């Protein structure tokens, strides 16, 4: 537990996408509760949130 901050990634247990209901989402770091609707806003290739 020294030298560089090494990341060992982790397990990848992904589930199906939720269309329209209040669910608990874990979007690879973001935790909360809400409805995951479709979007019209356009992101950038380096922007994640």
């Amino acid at each position: 537990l020294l030298h560089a901050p090494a990341t060992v990634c982790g397990p990848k247990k992904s589930t199906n996408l939720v269309k329209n209901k209040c669910v608990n989402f874990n979007f690879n770091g973001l935790t909360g509760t809400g409805v995951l609707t479709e979007s019209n806003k356009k992101f950038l290739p380096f922007q994640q949130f």
């Binding site: 560089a4 990341t7 950038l44 380096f46």
Partner: peptide
Amino acid sequence: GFSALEPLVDLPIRFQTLLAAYYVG
């Protein structure tokens, strides 16, 4: 002119150059 600099690559871990008219900031 104004131009924002997008991230290229983040690499997890005396200045010289080779081939001019280059600047250094």
